[PDB]
Amino acid sequence: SFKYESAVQYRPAPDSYLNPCPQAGRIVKETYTGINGTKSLNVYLPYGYDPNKKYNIFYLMHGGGENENTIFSNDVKLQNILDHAIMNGELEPLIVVTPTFNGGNCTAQNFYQEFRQNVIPFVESKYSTYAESTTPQGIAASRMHRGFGGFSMGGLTTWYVMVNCLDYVAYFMPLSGDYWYGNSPQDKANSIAEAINRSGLSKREYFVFAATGSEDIAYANMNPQIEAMKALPHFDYTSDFSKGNFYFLVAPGATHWWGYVRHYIYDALPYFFHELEHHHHHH
């Protein structure tokens, strides 16, 4: 009973969504060794997680100064929003992964390489996604059920994920972060357009739901990037992803703080993973 709207507006989760929900997804701390050394991440599995079913997966990056535990810590409590939203039927059940760009030689900009080579095969070998295998071919063939997003420095991470991993990821949620590649907004947009051209993908095969707050400094550099992207033929601007593939949600009054950004995820994540989905849904 989710229905797409064409210009979804900011709306915070009800306050009760911030308290624990009895139908709580399990959160598993995992440790793996990859190109940036031994690192950890958290896997949120939906209440009712059944290893015989296939789940969409969304990887979600923290901001500067934070870590893999931030988003499910008491300072953010994203899992309470996820739990209550899934239990109420606003959000189809999914796996949510919070990794880190910290450790070894990792940075927000270069994390996409560890993501492709280590993080995906590590997580999706153990937890049931649409990936039928974790070879490059098997990851690529489940791209429509895989998303990436993040806040601030983790927003920057998302843009670099999109430009380097369109073959593996179809849905993007950059929050309060702009793409640092280029000397003008057009350089940023053209870089994105060129990665799209190289991928071969049609316009119905990638989706960008960006967001920030009207009181968030990230707005000043995001907005011109968004305007340059809108002018590309690669993007059709609308939150109705049955018709287009690009939107920019700007929350009135919101500042550069997880207390607000978590609600951007509540607003946007229910828009993800419906195009070419395996179920029979009317959205």
Side-chain angles (χ1 to χ4, degrees), residues 91-134:
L91 177 58
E92 298 171 24
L94 86 174
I95 293 159
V96 177
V97 178
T98 62
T100 183
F101 60 64
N102 305 326
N105 289 348
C106 204
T107 60
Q109 64 146 258
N110 73 24
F111 174 76
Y112 67 83
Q113 195 63 49
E114 187 184 349
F115 176 64
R116 298 176 68 79
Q117 274 181 254
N118 308 123
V119 172
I120 293 175
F122 178 76
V123 170
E124 301 197 29
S125 288
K126 185 157 201 300
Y127 300 107
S128 186
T129 72
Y130 281 88
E132 219 138 53
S133 70
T134 46

mmCIF file of all heavy atoms in Angstrom, residues 91-134:
data_model
loop_
_atom_site.group_PDB
_atom_site.id
_atom_site.type_symbol
_atom_site.label_atom_id
_atom_site.label_comp_id
_atom_site.label_asym_id
_atom_site.label_seq_id
_atom_site.Cartn_x
_atom_site.Cartn_y
_atom_site.Cartn_z
ATOM 1 N N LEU A 91 7.451 0.269 5.015
ATOM 2 C CA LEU A 91 8.742 -0.061 4.472
ATOM 3 C C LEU A 91 8.790 -1.547 4.316
ATOM 4 O O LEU A 91 8.510 -2.222 5.254
ATOM 5 C CB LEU A 91 9.837 0.382 5.432
ATOM 6 C CG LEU A 91 11.266 0.027 4.993
ATOM 7 C CD1 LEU A 91 11.609 0.616 3.654
ATOM 8 C CD2 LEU A 91 12.254 0.531 6.000
ATOM 9 N N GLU A 92 9.078 -2.044 3.102
ATOM 10 C CA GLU A 92 9.219 -3.475 2.848
ATOM 11 C C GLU A 92 10.490 -3.952 3.542
ATOM 12 O O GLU A 92 11.438 -3.205 3.675
ATOM 13 C CB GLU A 92 9.230 -3.824 1.336
ATOM 14 C CG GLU A 92 7.879 -3.422 0.630
ATOM 15 C CD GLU A 92 7.945 -3.551 -0.890
ATOM 16 O OE1 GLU A 92 8.810 -4.369 -1.408
ATOM 17 O OE2 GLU A 92 7.141 -2.867 -1.560
ATOM 18 N N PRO A 93 10.448 -5.154 4.098
ATOM 19 C CA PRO A 93 11.551 -5.601 4.876
ATOM 20 C C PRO A 93 12.832 -5.666 4.028
ATOM 21 O O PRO A 93 12.810 -6.007 2.897
ATOM 22 C CB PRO A 93 11.135 -6.989 5.355
ATOM 23 C CG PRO A 93 9.838 -7.352 4.654
ATOM 24 C CD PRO A 93 9.280 -6.076 4.134
ATOM 25 N N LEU A 94 13.931 -5.258 4.638
ATOM 26 C CA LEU A 94 15.221 -5.217 3.959
ATOM 27 C C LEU A 94 16.370 -5.340 4.964
ATOM 28 O O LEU A 94 16.161 -5.178 6.137
ATOM 29 C CB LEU A 94 15.380 -3.971 3.060
ATOM 30 C CG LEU A 94 15.880 -2.718 3.736
ATOM 31 C CD1 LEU A 94 16.102 -1.653 2.663
ATOM 32 C CD2 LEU A 94 14.937 -2.208 4.818
ATOM 33 N N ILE A 95 17.556 -5.622 4.451
ATOM 34 C CA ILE A 95 18.757 -5.665 5.219
ATOM 35 C C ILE A 95 19.413 -4.309 5.050
ATOM 36 O O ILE A 95 19.459 -3.761 3.945
ATOM 37 C CB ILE A 95 19.707 -6.742 4.656
ATOM 38 C CG1 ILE A 95 19.113 -8.113 4.877
ATOM 39 C CG2 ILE A 95 21.080 -6.643 5.287
ATOM 40 C CD1 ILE A 95 19.691 -9.157 3.940
ATOM 41 N N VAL A 96 19.908 -3.777 6.154
ATOM 42 C CA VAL A 96 20.593 -2.498 6.166
ATOM 43 C C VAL A 96 21.970 -2.675 6.758
ATOM 44 O O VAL A 96 22.075 -3.221 7.849
ATOM 45 C CB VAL A 96 19.828 -1.371 6.926
ATOM 46 C CG1 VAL A 96 20.674 -0.114 6.945
ATOM 47 C CG2 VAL A 96 18.459 -1.104 6.262
ATOM 48 N N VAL A 97 23.002 -2.260 6.029
ATOM 49 C CA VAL A 97 24.387 -2.481 6.490
ATOM 50 C C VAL A 97 25.047 -1.139 6.802
ATOM 51 O O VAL A 97 24.963 -0.208 6.005
ATOM 52 C CB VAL A 97 25.194 -3.236 5.435
ATOM 53 C CG1 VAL A 97 26.643 -3.431 5.856
ATOM 54 C CG2 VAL A 97 24.560 -4.579 5.176
ATOM 55 N N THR A 98 25.674 -1.004 7.964
ATOM 56 C CA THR A 98 26.433 0.192 8.311
ATOM 57 C C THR A 98 27.928 -0.163 8.433
ATOM 58 O O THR A 98 28.362 -0.689 9.428
ATOM 59 C CB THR A 98 25.922 0.798 9.633
ATOM 60 O OG1 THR A 98 26.094 -0.127 10.734
ATOM 61 C CG2 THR A 98 24.473 1.143 9.429
ATOM 62 N N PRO A 99 28.701 0.058 7.379
ATOM 63 C CA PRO A 99 30.138 -0.170 7.395
ATOM 64 C C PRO A 99 30.874 1.096 7.820
ATOM 65 O O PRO A 99 30.267 2.088 8.337
ATOM 66 C CB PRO A 99 30.414 -0.477 5.921
ATOM 67 C CG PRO A 99 29.420 0.351 5.141
ATOM 68 C CD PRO A 99 28.200 0.426 6.034
ATOM 69 N N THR A 100 32.184 1.092 7.671
ATOM 70 C CA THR A 100 32.949 2.319 7.975
ATOM 71 C C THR A 100 33.966 2.575 6.917
ATOM 72 O O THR A 100 34.530 1.649 6.338
ATOM 73 C CB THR A 100 33.623 2.255 9.353
ATOM 74 O OG1 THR A 100 34.309 3.495 9.634
ATOM 75 C CG2 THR A 100 34.604 1.169 9.393
ATOM 76 N N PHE A 101 34.190 3.852 6.644
ATOM 77 C CA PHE A 101 35.356 4.283 5.823
ATOM 78 C C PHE A 101 36.639 4.499 6.647
ATOM 79 O O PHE A 101 37.656 4.885 6.096
ATOM 80 C CB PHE A 101 35.018 5.552 4.971
ATOM 81 C CG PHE A 101 34.615 6.782 5.748
ATOM 82 C CD1 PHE A 101 35.508 7.429 6.638
ATOM 83 C CD2 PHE A 101 33.372 7.328 5.581
ATOM 84 C CE1 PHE A 101 35.137 8.582 7.334
ATOM 85 C CE2 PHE A 101 33.012 8.501 6.253
ATOM 86 C CZ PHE A 101 33.918 9.150 7.098
ATOM 87 N N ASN A 102 36.607 4.262 7.973
ATOM 88 C CA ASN A 102 37.837 4.294 8.790
ATOM 89 C C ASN A 102 38.719 3.052 8.573
ATOM 90 O O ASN A 102 38.246 2.032 8.037
ATOM 91 C CB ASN A 102 37.520 4.319 10.288
ATOM 92 C CG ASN A 102 36.609 5.456 10.676
ATOM 93 O OD1 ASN A 102 36.652 6.521 10.119
ATOM 94 N ND2 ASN A 102 35.773 5.208 11.683
ATOM 95 N N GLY A 103 39.963 3.110 9.041
ATOM 96 C CA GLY A 103 40.866 1.950 9.082
ATOM 97 C C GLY A 103 41.806 1.865 7.864
ATOM 98 O O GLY A 103 41.453 2.115 6.685
ATOM 99 N N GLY A 104 43.049 1.489 8.173
ATOM 100 C CA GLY A 104 44.067 1.241 7.161
ATOM 101 C C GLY A 104 44.247 2.486 6.308
ATOM 102 O O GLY A 104 44.270 3.584 6.817
ATOM 103 N N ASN A 105 44.258 2.287 5.008
ATOM 104 C CA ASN A 105 44.323 3.396 4.050
ATOM 105 C C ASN A 105 42.939 3.887 3.576
ATOM 106 O O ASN A 105 42.862 4.628 2.593
ATOM 107 C CB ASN A 105 45.106 2.920 2.798
ATOM 108 C CG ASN A 105 46.614 2.742 3.071
ATOM 109 O OD1 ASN A 105 47.144 3.180 4.128
ATOM 110 N ND2 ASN A 105 47.323 2.140 2.091
ATOM 111 N N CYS A 106 41.863 3.455 4.244
ATOM 112 C CA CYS A 106 40.512 3.782 3.801
ATOM 113 C C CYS A 106 40.213 5.257 4.044
ATOM 114 O O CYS A 106 40.625 5.825 5.020
ATOM 115 C CB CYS A 106 39.452 2.893 4.504
ATOM 116 S SG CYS A 106 37.932 2.766 3.544
ATOM 117 N N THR A 107 39.503 5.868 3.110
ATOM 118 C CA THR A 107 38.926 7.214 3.305
ATOM 119 C C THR A 107 37.501 7.219 2.744
ATOM 120 O O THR A 107 37.117 6.311 2.005
ATOM 121 C CB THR A 107 39.661 8.288 2.477
ATOM 122 O OG1 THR A 107 39.571 7.965 1.111
ATOM 123 C CG2 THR A 107 41.153 8.356 2.843
ATOM 124 N N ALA A 108 36.744 8.279 2.995
ATOM 125 C CA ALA A 108 35.463 8.378 2.400
ATOM 126 C C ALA A 108 35.529 8.293 0.915
ATOM 127 O O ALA A 108 34.634 7.634 0.354
ATOM 128 C CB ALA A 108 34.784 9.635 2.779
ATOM 129 N N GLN A 109 36.512 8.906 0.266
ATOM 130 C CA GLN A 109 36.538 8.865 -1.186
ATOM 131 C C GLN A 109 36.937 7.509 -1.713
ATOM 132 O O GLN A 109 36.448 7.142 -2.768
ATOM 133 C CB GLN A 109 37.406 9.995 -1.920
ATOM 134 C CG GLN A 109 38.896 9.954 -1.649
ATOM 135 C CD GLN A 109 39.923 10.383 -2.804
ATOM 136 O OE1 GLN A 109 40.543 9.489 -3.480
ATOM 137 N NE2 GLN A 109 40.206 11.718 -2.909
ATOM 138 N N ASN A 110 37.859 6.790 -1.081
ATOM 139 C CA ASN A 110 38.287 5.565 -1.723
ATOM 140 C C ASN A 110 37.546 4.313 -1.287
ATOM 141 O O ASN A 110 37.799 3.222 -1.790
ATOM 142 C CB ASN A 110 39.785 5.368 -1.658
ATOM 143 C CG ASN A 110 40.289 4.983 -0.282
ATOM 144 O OD1 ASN A 110 39.553 4.415 0.578
ATOM 145 N ND2 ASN A 110 41.605 5.236 -0.062
ATOM 146 N N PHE A 111 36.626 4.444 -0.333
ATOM 147 C CA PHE A 111 35.927 3.245 0.235
ATOM 148 C C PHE A 111 35.254 2.334 -0.829
ATOM 149 O O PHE A 111 35.162 1.177 -0.634
ATOM 150 C CB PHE A 111 34.866 3.684 1.261
ATOM 151 C CG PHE A 111 34.012 2.549 1.786
ATOM 152 C CD1 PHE A 111 34.520 1.652 2.731
ATOM 153 C CD2 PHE A 111 32.739 2.348 1.279
ATOM 154 C CE1 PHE A 111 33.744 0.599 3.184
ATOM 155 C CE2 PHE A 111 31.967 1.358 1.725
ATOM 156 C CZ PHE A 111 32.468 0.461 2.677
ATOM 157 N N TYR A 112 34.839 2.864 -1.966
ATOM 158 C CA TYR A 112 34.134 2.083 -2.956
ATOM 159 C C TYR A 112 34.899 0.831 -3.397
ATOM 160 O O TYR A 112 34.311 -0.170 -3.768
ATOM 161 C CB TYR A 112 33.747 2.924 -4.175
ATOM 162 C CG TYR A 112 34.922 3.400 -4.972
ATOM 163 C CD1 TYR A 112 35.516 2.581 -5.924
ATOM 164 C CD2 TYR A 112 35.496 4.637 -4.707
ATOM 165 C CE1 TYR A 112 36.593 3.006 -6.645
ATOM 166 C CE2 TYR A 112 36.593 5.062 -5.391
ATOM 167 C CZ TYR A 112 37.161 4.250 -6.358
ATOM 168 O OH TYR A 112 38.293 4.716 -7.047
ATOM 169 N N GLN A 113 36.211 0.887 -3.357
ATOM 170 C CA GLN A 113 37.039 -0.249 -3.769
ATOM 171 C C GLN A 113 36.954 -1.419 -2.806
ATOM 172 O O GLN A 113 36.691 -2.505 -3.203
ATOM 173 C CB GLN A 113 38.467 0.133 -3.913
ATOM 174 C CG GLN A 113 39.109 -1.031 -4.690
ATOM 175 C CD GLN A 113 38.524 -1.210 -6.116
ATOM 176 O OE1 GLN A 113 38.401 -0.241 -6.902
ATOM 177 N NE2 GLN A 113 38.259 -2.440 -6.462
ATOM 178 N N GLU A 114 37.096 -1.140 -1.520
ATOM 179 C CA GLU A 114 36.832 -2.126 -0.460
ATOM 180 C C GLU A 114 35.404 -2.649 -0.487
ATOM 181 O O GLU A 114 35.164 -3.853 -0.263
ATOM 182 C CB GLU A 114 37.118 -1.506 0.875
ATOM 183 C CG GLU A 114 37.025 -2.484 1.996
ATOM 184 C CD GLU A 114 37.206 -1.888 3.370
ATOM 185 O OE1 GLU A 114 37.612 -0.698 3.483
ATOM 186 O OE2 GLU A 114 36.878 -2.627 4.365
ATOM 187 N N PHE A 115 34.463 -1.734 -0.755
ATOM 188 C CA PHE A 115 33.042 -2.067 -0.911
ATOM 189 C C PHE A 115 32.837 -3.160 -1.974
ATOM 190 O O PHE A 115 32.183 -4.177 -1.718
ATOM 191 C CB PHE A 115 32.228 -0.782 -1.244
ATOM 192 C CG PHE A 115 30.763 -1.012 -1.529
ATOM 193 C CD1 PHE A 115 29.931 -1.489 -0.570
ATOM 194 C CD2 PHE A 115 30.217 -0.650 -2.748
ATOM 195 C CE1 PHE A 115 28.580 -1.691 -0.810
ATOM 196 C CE2 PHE A 115 28.863 -0.797 -2.996
ATOM 197 C CZ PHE A 115 28.046 -1.368 -2.022
ATOM 198 N N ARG A 116 33.363 -2.914 -3.172
ATOM 199 C CA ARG A 116 33.205 -3.833 -4.295
ATOM 200 C C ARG A 116 33.870 -5.171 -3.992
ATOM 201 O O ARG A 116 33.307 -6.237 -4.280
ATOM 202 C CB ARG A 116 33.925 -3.308 -5.547
ATOM 203 C CG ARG A 116 33.505 -2.046 -6.138
ATOM 204 C CD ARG A 116 34.441 -1.712 -7.307
ATOM 205 N NE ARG A 116 34.208 -2.693 -8.372
ATOM 206 C CZ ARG A 116 33.191 -2.664 -9.215
ATOM 207 N NH1 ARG A 116 32.263 -1.685 -9.147
ATOM 208 N NH2 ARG A 116 33.080 -3.626 -10.143
ATOM 209 N N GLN A 117 35.092 -5.142 -3.477
ATOM 210 C CA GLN A 117 35.894 -6.363 -3.396
ATOM 211 C C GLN A 117 35.715 -7.183 -2.146
ATOM 212 O O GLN A 117 35.928 -8.390 -2.194
ATOM 213 C CB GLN A 117 37.399 -6.032 -3.410
ATOM 214 C CG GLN A 117 37.993 -5.885 -4.774
ATOM 215 C CD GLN A 117 39.488 -5.582 -4.755
ATOM 216 O OE1 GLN A 117 39.903 -4.478 -5.018
ATOM 217 N NE2 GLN A 117 40.286 -6.569 -4.455
ATOM 218 N N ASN A 118 35.474 -6.505 -1.031
ATOM 219 C CA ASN A 118 35.375 -7.141 0.232
ATOM 220 C C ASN A 118 33.984 -7.095 0.854
ATOM 221 O O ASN A 118 33.530 -8.117 1.367
ATOM 222 C CB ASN A 118 36.387 -6.498 1.180
ATOM 223 C CG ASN A 118 37.818 -6.472 0.565
ATOM 224 O OD1 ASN A 118 38.455 -5.405 0.417
ATOM 225 N ND2 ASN A 118 38.287 -7.675 0.141
ATOM 226 N N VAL A 119 33.340 -5.916 0.865
ATOM 227 C CA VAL A 119 32.187 -5.723 1.744
ATOM 228 C C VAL A 119 31.033 -6.466 1.147
ATOM 229 O O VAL A 119 30.415 -7.291 1.836
ATOM 230 C CB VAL A 119 31.844 -4.258 2.013
ATOM 231 C CG1 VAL A 119 30.514 -4.170 2.771
ATOM 232 C CG2 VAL A 119 32.956 -3.609 2.819
ATOM 233 N N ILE A 120 30.771 -6.259 -0.126
ATOM 234 C CA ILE A 120 29.704 -7.005 -0.780
ATOM 235 C C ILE A 120 29.849 -8.518 -0.669
ATOM 236 O O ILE A 120 28.924 -9.185 -0.178
ATOM 237 C CB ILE A 120 29.425 -6.549 -2.209
ATOM 238 C CG1 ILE A 120 28.852 -5.125 -2.216
ATOM 239 C CG2 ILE A 120 28.392 -7.459 -2.866
ATOM 240 C CD1 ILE A 120 28.642 -4.531 -3.635
ATOM 241 N N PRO A 121 30.986 -9.080 -1.087
ATOM 242 C CA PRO A 121 31.046 -10.529 -1.007
ATOM 243 C C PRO A 121 30.998 -11.059 0.412
ATOM 244 O O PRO A 121 30.329 -12.079 0.638
ATOM 245 C CB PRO A 121 32.356 -10.933 -1.721
ATOM 246 C CG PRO A 121 32.929 -9.678 -2.341
ATOM 247 C CD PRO A 121 31.997 -8.504 -1.996
ATOM 248 N N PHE A 122 31.583 -10.348 1.367
ATOM 249 C CA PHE A 122 31.485 -10.754 2.746
ATOM 250 C C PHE A 122 30.050 -10.767 3.327
ATOM 251 O O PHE A 122 29.628 -11.759 3.944
ATOM 252 C CB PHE A 122 32.374 -9.897 3.637
ATOM 253 C CG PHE A 122 32.275 -10.253 5.047
ATOM 254 C CD1 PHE A 122 32.897 -11.392 5.524
ATOM 255 C CD2 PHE A 122 31.533 -9.523 5.907
ATOM 256 C CE1 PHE A 122 32.776 -11.762 6.882
ATOM 257 C CE2 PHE A 122 31.429 -9.857 7.252
ATOM 258 C CZ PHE A 122 32.013 -10.997 7.730
ATOM 259 N N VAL A 123 29.301 -9.675 3.148
ATOM 260 C CA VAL A 123 27.964 -9.603 3.673
ATOM 261 C C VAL A 123 26.995 -10.575 2.954
ATOM 262 O O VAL A 123 26.261 -11.316 3.576
ATOM 263 C CB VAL A 123 27.458 -8.150 3.606
ATOM 264 C CG1 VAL A 123 25.980 -8.096 3.910
ATOM 265 C CG2 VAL A 123 28.263 -7.215 4.527
ATOM 266 N N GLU A 124 27.033 -10.589 1.646
ATOM 267 C CA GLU A 124 25.998 -11.228 0.868
ATOM 268 C C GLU A 124 26.186 -12.749 0.623
ATOM 269 O O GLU A 124 25.291 -13.421 0.125
ATOM 270 C CB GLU A 124 25.840 -10.435 -0.450
ATOM 271 C CG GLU A 124 25.465 -8.975 -0.143
ATOM 272 C CD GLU A 124 24.898 -8.217 -1.309
ATOM 273 O OE1 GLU A 124 24.272 -8.833 -2.193
ATOM 274 O OE2 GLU A 124 25.100 -6.982 -1.339
ATOM 275 N N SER A 125 27.372 -13.228 0.968
ATOM 276 C CA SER A 125 27.715 -14.663 1.133
ATOM 277 C C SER A 125 27.005 -15.204 2.417
ATOM 278 O O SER A 125 26.649 -16.411 2.537
ATOM 279 C CB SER A 125 29.318 -14.857 1.204
ATOM 280 O OG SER A 125 29.919 -14.652 -0.013
ATOM 281 N N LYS A 126 26.845 -14.356 3.424
ATOM 282 C CA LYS A 126 26.267 -14.816 4.688
ATOM 283 C C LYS A 126 24.759 -14.529 4.842
ATOM 284 O O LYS A 126 24.019 -15.264 5.529
ATOM 285 C CB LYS A 126 27.015 -14.107 5.790
ATOM 286 C CG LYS A 126 26.696 -14.488 7.236
ATOM 287 C CD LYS A 126 27.951 -14.080 8.087
ATOM 288 C CE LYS A 126 28.101 -14.788 9.444
ATOM 289 N NZ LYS A 126 26.986 -14.598 10.408
ATOM 290 N N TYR A 127 24.304 -13.437 4.231
ATOM 291 C CA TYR A 127 22.925 -12.957 4.420
ATOM 292 C C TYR A 127 22.250 -12.950 3.090
ATOM 293 O O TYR A 127 22.853 -12.686 2.046
ATOM 294 C CB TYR A 127 22.885 -11.605 5.111
ATOM 295 C CG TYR A 127 23.529 -11.641 6.474
ATOM 296 C CD1 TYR A 127 24.739 -11.070 6.713
ATOM 297 C CD2 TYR A 127 22.892 -12.245 7.521
ATOM 298 C CE1 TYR A 127 25.320 -11.115 7.977
ATOM 299 C CE2 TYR A 127 23.453 -12.313 8.796
ATOM 300 C CZ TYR A 127 24.668 -11.746 9.032
ATOM 301 O OH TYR A 127 25.233 -11.836 10.299
ATOM 302 N N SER A 128 20.991 -13.291 3.117
ATOM 303 C CA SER A 128 20.231 -13.573 1.890
ATOM 304 C C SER A 128 19.728 -12.382 1.128
ATOM 305 O O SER A 128 18.618 -11.840 1.420
ATOM 306 C CB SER A 128 19.025 -14.442 2.226
ATOM 307 O OG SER A 128 18.385 -14.814 1.001
ATOM 308 N N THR A 129 20.456 -12.058 0.062
ATOM 309 C CA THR A 129 20.073 -10.974 -0.776
ATOM 310 C C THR A 129 19.595 -11.533 -2.080
ATOM 311 O O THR A 129 19.394 -12.732 -2.224
ATOM 312 C CB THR A 129 21.229 -10.001 -1.004
ATOM 313 O OG1 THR A 129 22.190 -10.562 -1.834
ATOM 314 C CG2 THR A 129 21.907 -9.616 0.265
ATOM 315 N N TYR A 130 19.375 -10.695 -3.058
ATOM 316 C CA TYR A 130 19.071 -11.211 -4.380
ATOM 317 C C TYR A 130 20.298 -11.715 -5.110
ATOM 318 O O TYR A 130 20.184 -12.234 -6.224
ATOM 319 C CB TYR A 130 18.336 -10.147 -5.209
ATOM 320 C CG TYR A 130 16.896 -10.061 -4.858
ATOM 321 C CD1 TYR A 130 16.475 -9.227 -3.837
ATOM 322 C CD2 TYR A 130 15.936 -10.823 -5.543
ATOM 323 C CE1 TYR A 130 15.148 -9.121 -3.450
ATOM 324 C CE2 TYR A 130 14.576 -10.714 -5.180
ATOM 325 C CZ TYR A 130 14.196 -9.858 -4.129
ATOM 326 O OH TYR A 130 12.846 -9.752 -3.749
ATOM 327 N N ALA A 131 21.470 -11.554 -4.551
ATOM 328 C CA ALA A 131 22.640 -12.087 -5.237
ATOM 329 C C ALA A 131 22.590 -13.624 -5.198
ATOM 330 O O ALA A 131 22.610 -14.191 -4.195
ATOM 331 C CB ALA A 131 23.901 -11.615 -4.579
ATOM 332 N N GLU A 132 22.666 -14.259 -6.327
ATOM 333 C CA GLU A 132 22.582 -15.727 -6.423
ATOM 334 C C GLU A 132 23.970 -16.327 -6.133
ATOM 335 O O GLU A 132 24.082 -17.446 -5.587
ATOM 336 C CB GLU A 132 22.094 -16.055 -7.860
ATOM 337 C CG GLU A 132 21.095 -17.206 -7.991
ATOM 338 C CD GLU A 132 19.954 -16.929 -8.972
ATOM 339 O OE1 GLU A 132 20.202 -16.554 -10.156
ATOM 340 O OE2 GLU A 132 18.804 -17.135 -8.529
ATOM 341 N N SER A 133 25.007 -15.567 -6.491
ATOM 342 C CA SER A 133 26.352 -15.784 -6.011
ATOM 343 C C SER A 133 26.997 -14.408 -5.816
ATOM 344 O O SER A 133 26.438 -13.376 -6.234
ATOM 345 C CB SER A 133 27.146 -16.556 -7.046
ATOM 346 O OG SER A 133 27.396 -15.728 -8.175
ATOM 347 N N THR A 134 28.163 -14.432 -5.198
ATOM 348 C CA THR A 134 28.963 -13.254 -4.907
ATOM 349 C C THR A 134 30.166 -13.060 -5.800
ATOM 350 O O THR A 134 31.049 -12.281 -5.500
ATOM 351 C CB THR A 134 29.408 -13.250 -3.415
ATOM 352 O OG1 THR A 134 29.931 -14.548 -2.976
ATOM 353 C CG2 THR A 134 28.155 -12.967 -2.611
#
